[PDB]
A paper describes a structure:
In flies, Centrosomin (Cnn) forms a phosphorylation-dependent scaffold that recruits proteins to the mitotic centrosome, but how Cnn assembles into a scaffold is unclear. We show that scaffold assembly requires conserved leucine zipper (LZ) and Cnn-motif 2 (CM2) domains that co-assemble into a 2:2 complex in vitro. Purified CM2 forms a stable 2:2 tetramer with the purified LZ of the PReM domain, and we solve the crystal structure of the LZ:CM2 complex, revealing that helical dimers of LZ and CM2 interact in an anti-parallel fashion. Thus, Cnn molecules have an intrinsic ability to form large, LZ:CM2-interaction-dependent assemblies that are critical for mitotic centrosome assembly.
Domain boundaries were designed using PSIPRED, and we recombinantly expressed and purified a 55aa “LZ” fragment (aa490–544) and a 67aa “CM2” fragment (aa1082–1148) from bacteria. Crystallization of the LZ:CM2 hetero-tetramer revealed that the LZ and CM2 were entirely α helical, with each domain forming a parallel homo-dimer that interacted in an anti-parallel fashion to form the 2:2 hetero-tetrameric complex. Although the N-terminal half of CM2 formed a canonical coiled coil, the C-terminal half adopted an unusual “splayed” conformation that wrapped around and clasped the coiled coil of the LZ. A splayed C terminus was also observed in crystals of CM2 alone, indicating it is a feature of the CM2 sequence rather than being driven by the interaction with the LZ. Assembly of the LZ:CM2 tetramer buried the canonical Leu residues that define the LZ (L528, L532, L535, L539, L542) (blue asterisks, Figure 2A; blue residues, Figure 4A), and also three residues that appear to be invariant within CM2 domains across species (Ile1126, Thr1133, and Leu1137) (orange asterisks; Figure 4A, orange residues,). Two Cys residues conserved within Drosophila species in the LZ region (C521, C525) line the interior of the coiled coil, with C521 consistently forming a homotypic disulfide bond.
Residue numbers in the entry:
A (entry chain B): 1081 to 1141
B (entry chain A): 1081 to 1140
C (entry chain C): 508 to 544
D (entry chain D): 497 to 544
Amino acid sequence: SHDCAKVDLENAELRRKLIRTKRAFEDTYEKLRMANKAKAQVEKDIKNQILKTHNVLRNVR
Amino acid sequence: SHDCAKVDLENAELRRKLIRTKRAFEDTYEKLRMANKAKAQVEKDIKNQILKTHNVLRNV
Amino acid sequence: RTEVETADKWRLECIDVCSVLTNRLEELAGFLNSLLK
Amino acid sequence: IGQLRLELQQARTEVETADKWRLECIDVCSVLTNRLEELAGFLNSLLK
Ligand SMILES: [Cl-]
Ligand SMILES: [Zn+2]
């Protein structure tokens, strides 16, 4: 036996918290995905710039 | 006024899901905080390197 | 023969300059590489 | 006499070598400078 009104109240509060927390997780996960993507692009361009720099250094005396 | 056993099961399942989602959000938030911190450090060092480069170019 | 003097007036300077520029370029390649860690 | 001609030839050779050194160092300095300016702009682009 439980407190019927209390478990109804807790059911509703848990559902509210779960929506809020899922939304916070999806938003933060998307922010992290965007950050990782931007960093990967940066590292690709950095590699290109390193290679161009060494090419100049090799051609230069 | 409800199905007592059914709301008990649903409440237990909601609590399990909320723990799982809270943990995922906290872990992902921690990773994002770490990434932001690392990027902030990179941008500070980049600033110093730009300034040294412009100083060398200016003296030449 | 002053053409030699005037034409060599900035030789030592341009050598020092190229050394400093090369050093900055090498340091920049190392720094960029450090960003990939 | 012919010694003045020989020393004039030596002066011309020294001018040629000095001009070669100068133009080569200008070429090198130019390429290095351009790479450094490009790198400064790239680094700045990373701050956006
Ligand atoms: Cl470039
Ligand atoms: Zn009940």
